[PDB]
């Protein structure tokens, strides 16, 4: 049976509890934590590319008022879709389930400033969603898994202090 499994997930659960934010620039950010996940019940033999979107989780905007998140205002129009592709795709189901995929170079901006990077609405909530395509698929197969733990809110800068001080923390 196929098996997606978010790596450190008590890491991301301790973002997670104080509300997670990440950095958008002119010219991309990485990402922290970075999403890892292991992977179980592909088949070996067969090619897949692993691909990572970001979902836009409410229909309102957030804004953090008196050291909480509140609703703050209705969104902006939806970021355009914007779809990363693991550097190792196409790879073997066996490369896939041998060790952890890591999404470690994906950046994230509020420009589309090309560079493969994701554009994000600031004070937008997103859930990181991966994507598996079997490669030679007359029915282009693909499966998606959610990573509720990896919520965060795009920011231009840290508004909660306490997420400033944990990035440099375990960082
Ligand atoms: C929550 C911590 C242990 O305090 N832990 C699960 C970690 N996991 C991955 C990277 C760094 C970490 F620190």
Same mark, same amino acid.
């Given at each position: 049976?196929?098996?997606?499994?978010?790596?450190?997930?008590?890491?991301?659960?301790?973002?997670?509890?104080?509300?997670?934010?990440?950095?958008?620039?002119?010219?991309?950010?990485?990402?922290?934590?970075?999403?890892?996940?292991?992977?179980?019940?592909?088949?070996?033999?067969?090619?897949?590319?692993?691909?990572?979107?970001?979902?836009?989780?409410?229909?309102?905007?957030?804004?953090?008022?008196?050291?909480?998140?509140?609703?703050?205002?209705?969104?902006?129009?939806?970021?355009?879709?914007?779809?990363?592709?693991?550097?190792? =795709?196409?790879?073997?189901?066996?490369?896939?389930?041998?060790?952890?995929? =890591?999404?470690?170079?994906?950046?994230?901006?509020?420009?589309?400033?090309?560079?493969?990077?994701?554009?994000?609405?600031?004070?937008?909530?997103?859930?990181?969603? /991966?994507?598996?395509?079997?490669?030679?698929?007359?029915?282009?197969?693909?499966? =998606?898994?959610?990573?509720?733990?990896?919520?965060?809110?795009?920011?231009?800068?840290?508004?909660?202090?306490?997420?400033?001080?944990?990035? /440099?923390?375990?960082?």
């Amino acid at each position: 049976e196929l098996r997606v499994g978010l790596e450190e997930s008590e890491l991301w659960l301790r973002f997670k509890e104080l509300t997670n934010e990440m950095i958008v620039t002119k010219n991309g950010r990485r990402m922290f934590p970075v999403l890892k996940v292991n992977v179980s019940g592909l088949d070996p033999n067969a090619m897949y590319s692993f691909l990572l979107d970001f979902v836009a989780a409410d229909n309102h905007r957030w804004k953090y008022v008196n050291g909480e998140w509140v609703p703050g205002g209705k969104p902006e129009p939806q970021a355009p879709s914007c779809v990363y592709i693991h550097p190792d =795709s196409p790879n073997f189901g066996a490369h896939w389930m041998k060790a952890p995929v =890591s999404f470690s170079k994906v950046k994230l901006t509020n420009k589309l400033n090309g560079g493969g990077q994701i554009m994000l609405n600031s004070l937008h909530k997103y859930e990181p969603r /991966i994507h598996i395509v079997r490669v030679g698929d007359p029915q282009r197969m693909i499966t =998606s898994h959610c990573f509720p733990e990896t919520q965060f809110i795009a920011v231009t800068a840290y508004q909660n202090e306490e997420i400033t001080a944990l990035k /440099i923390k375990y960082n």
